[PDB]
């Protein structure tokens, strides 16, 4: 598959087998940032699930354990001192998925311990009747980039454990977030600050985690209202966070946002699979599928001679270049 060629190329260009970490760029001077490494972890897991090449599948399965090992070697196992609740939760969510694939108890303990630290200590009802703080060092804002990923992490932990506590957490987080961090119609706000209120800046990765938490809640509950929520957020994305030809936007120069199409595509694939399997929203499903295929082909067609795609789809960086690889590993 094109997904096989894209992932092997991405590994050949950016994977460091000594440190067991991705390089940040094609100069190979520094390794990827901590949180982005959890998102390239998930990319390896998504290529693992996508490929029907059994030799590549087995090599990616090994790489799932190596990405964790390289990160724990550099940083330790206990990430609860990191001041960013979102740094912790990206890795808790990756760890839950690694448990689903491998069954290695260390990944369940990592996921649970890190999720529980954030939800139990950083969910607050003093400010705005709920929601998780951005930071554990200072409590001034509650952000989409911690709240929707936390919901997703809780839904993985519910799927793994069937402990209803995790479904209750996912539901409480998502309900609060739809009320306080969206316009009620699919546009996901960046954050809500104590002093200055809502900041209605939308981005690919916050549309993405909203969509993924909504689809996950649909799968856990069978309540169609959650798939409606996902559809409205996908429709916002396809009509607003795109150029005039319908290609998803380039969000640089911000280093966190430049690769956010990676997180968006991952979640849009969950919505695509669920609409295809359920027959929900069939008119939207057919149009969504056409729009995704157009985007994936615009990514495919943007490769250099080493089969790496820079994130401006309309020196190569691993986060920016990851989005095309994710798009081809739906
Ligand atoms: C947590 C963790 O990954 C840490 O390493 C990151 O530094 C941290 C970044 O999050 C902040 O910045 C992003 C991007 O902010 C910019 O884009 C926004 C959307 O357009 C805009 O509102 C903001 O003013 C900036 O221009 C935000 O998306 C986050 O909410 C947060 O402010 C990770 O959160």
Numbering used by the authors: 39 to 352, 359 to 374
Report text from the authors:
GH76 enzymes catalyse the hydrolysis of α‐1,6‐mannans, such as those found in the yeast cell wall, with net retention of anomeric configuration. In 2015 their 3D structure and putative catalytic itinerary were identified revealing ‐ in the case of the Bacillus circulans enzyme ‐ five enzyme subsites “‐3 to +2” (using the described nomenclature) with Asp124 acting as catalytic nucleophile and Asp125 as catalytic acid/base in a classic Koshland double‐displacement reaction. We show, notably through mass spectrometry and high resolution 3‐D structural analyses, how the disaccharide cyclophellitol is indeed a poor inhibitor, but how the trisaccharide versions, in particular the carbasugar‐stabilised one, potently inhibit B. circulans GH76. We used a more easily crystallizable variant, R341Q, designed to prevent formation of an intermolecular salt bridge due to crystal packing and allow ligand complex formation, but which is otherwise unchanged in catalytic machinery and efficiency.
In order to test our hypothesis about partial occupancy and ligand hydrolysis, we harnessed the D125 N variant of BcGH76. This is a variant of the catalytic acid/base which is inactive against unactivated glycosides, but which we reasoned would react with the 6‐epi‐manno‐cyclophellitol epoxides, even if at a reduced rate. The trisaccharide binds in the −3 to −1 subsites, with identical interactions to previous GH76 complexes in −3 and −2. In the −1 subsite, the 6‐epi‐manno‐cyclophellitol has opened (or is at least subsequently observed bound) trans‐equatorially (as opposed to the more common transdiaxial opening), Figure 2. The mannose ring is observed in 4C1 chair conformation ‐ one inconsistent with the proposed conformational pathway (OS2‐[B2,5]≠‐an intermediate initially in 1S5 conformation). However, in the −1 subsite, the pseudo‐sugar ring of the manno‐cyclophellitol is displaced from its position in the Michaelis complex with its ring plane rotated greatly (beyond perpendicular) to that seen in the natural substrate, to such an extent that the oxygens equivalent to O3 and O4 actually lie 5–6 Å from their positions observed for the Michaelis complex in a position that would not be possible for a natural substrate. Whilst other trapped cyclophellitols we have observed appear in conformations and positions consistent with the known itineraries of the enzymes, this is not the case here. Arguably, the active site mutants are not able to hydrolyse the glycosidic linkage connecting the manno‐disaccharide in 2 with the manno‐cyclophellitol.
